Write a protein that binds this ligand. Structure first.
Ligand SMILES: *OC(*)(*)(*)([C@@](*)(*)C(*)(*)(*)(C(*)(*)C1(*)(*)(*)=[C@@](*)(*)[C@@](*)(*)=[C@@](*)(*)[C@](*)(*)=[C@@]1(*)*)C(*)(*)(*)(=O*)[N@](*)(*)C1(*)(*)(*)C(*)(*)(*)(O*)[C@@](*)(*)C2(*)(*)(*)=C1(*)(*)(*)[C@@](*)(*)=[C@@](*)(*)[C@](*)(*)=[C@]2(*)*)[C@@](*)(*)C(*)(*)(*)([C@@](*)(*)C1(*)(*)(*)=[C@@](*)(*)[C@](*)(*)=[C@@](*)(*)[C@@](*)(*)=[C@@]1(*)*)C(*)(*)(*)(=O*)[N@@](*)(*)C1(*)(*)(*)C(*)(*)(*)(O*)[C@](*)(*)C2(*)(*)(*)=[C@](*)(*)[C@](*)(*)=[C@](*)(*)[C@](*)(*)=C12(*)(*)*
Lengths: 99, 99
């Protein structure tokens, strides 16, 4: 699709058989989702945003379907205000910015 | 132009005759630049992101040039770690997300 930015670019994602809403965020290096249960072991990671840093759990090789496009990569879980689809997955779905 | 997301999508902006570098951020509702002086009256505002909230100064009707394209809108100034071009101005230059 072609998404305009008059509103937040929210899309439905499916992870662990659940549907959630997430933001296509070109300003985000990584993907972070609100607290949830993900399979496997996690490694520690710190991410810095506008307000400062937070500690998140890092899971590798997670399948996530974004607007019906399957992607598999690293997903972080922590105290994020919204579910964020960052550049690591955007690139897997061939998303680009156009003007 | 068509911008890929292998790297952060950084562009050159021209504000108050000052030439700068900024991030095209679709995850950002507003535009926020690092501490600088704009002409006019400003209003205090609080914007929240990952890590919490920051206090910025809000200036209305500022002209910005993004990759040659002139755009007008509100510009926030504060302790942001990077200059960010949010949705309020990406819309003015006709930016869209495509996959
Ligand atoms: O884009 C980004 C993020 C976002 C998220 C969100 C959304 C919605 C709500 C909340 C949150 C943000 O923060 N946003 C915000 C809002 O919208 C309000 C405002 C904003 C912004 C601006 C203005 C206003 C952002 C970004 C920034 C930066 C960049 C670079 C560096 C630093 C900072 C962020 O944060 N990012 C980050 C990085 O890249 C790393 C990471 C990882 C993950 C995620 C994110 C991130």
């Amino acid at each position: 699709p072609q998404i305009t930015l008059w509103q937040r670019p929210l899309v439905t994602i499916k992870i662990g058989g659940q549907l959630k809403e997430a933001l296509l965020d070109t300003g985000a290096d990584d993907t972070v989702l609100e607290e949830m249960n993900l399979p496997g072991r996690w490694k520690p990671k710190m991410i810095g945003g506008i307000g400062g840093f937070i500690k998140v759990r890092q899971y590798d090789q997670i399948l996530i379907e974004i607007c019906g496009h399957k992607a598999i990569g690293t997903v972080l879980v922590g105290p994020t205000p919204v579910n964020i689809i960052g550049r690591n997955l955007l690139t897997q779905i061939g998303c680009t910015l156009n003007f």
